[PDB]
């Protein structure tokens, strides 16, 4: 199993409604989760089961998808959101990470 994240990099300004997607290449149904990666730091969990907001994360994040496609949306970009993002599946014990993506300031 392999997953592709598109786009690899994009730039946006404060308040932009950034939308990002990653493809699973197989029927994953709902076993997907999103992560936060501020470079120079270890990752953190953002959304699990592709739709649940973790208790330690602000409500400005949302996600949806099923089957083979999956999407992550940011309601409004804030100055600390500039960091690497990652999607990873758990429909198989040999779990894999996505191709990676980076958001940039503008």
């Amino acid at each position: 199993i392999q997953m592709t994240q598109s786009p690899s990099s994009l730039s946006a300004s404060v308040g932009d409604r950034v939308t990002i997607t990653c493809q699973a290449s197989q029927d994953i149904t709902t076993y997907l989760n999103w992560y936060q990666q501020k470079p120079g730091k270890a990752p953190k969990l953002l959304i699990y089961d592709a739709s649940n907001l973790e208790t330690g994360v602000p409500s400005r994040f949302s996600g949806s998808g099923s089957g083979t496609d999956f999407t992550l949306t940011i309601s409004s970009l804030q100055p600390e959101d500039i960091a690497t993002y990652y999607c990873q599946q758990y429909d198989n014990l040999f779990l894999t990470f996505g191709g990676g993506t980076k958001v940039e300031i503008k």
């Binding site: 149904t29 089961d49 739709s51 649940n52 099923s66």
Partner: protein, 50 residues
């Protein structure tokens, strides 16, 4: 002789328009390996089992 009494439990939420999570699960998998109701209960007959 060794007999393995393996119990498998699996359940999931009903796929549909509602992405509810705190609700009770709707579909239930419970199996007992070679258990088969028409044949009767699975009784261990070997000296050792787990």
């Amino acid at each position: 002789k060794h007999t393995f009494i393996v119990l498998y439990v699996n359940f999931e939420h009903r796929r549909g328009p509602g992405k509810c999570y705190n609700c009770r699960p709707a579909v239930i998998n419970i199996t007992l390996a070679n258990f088969n109701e028409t044949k009767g209960p699975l009784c261990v007959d070997t000296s050792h089992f787990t």
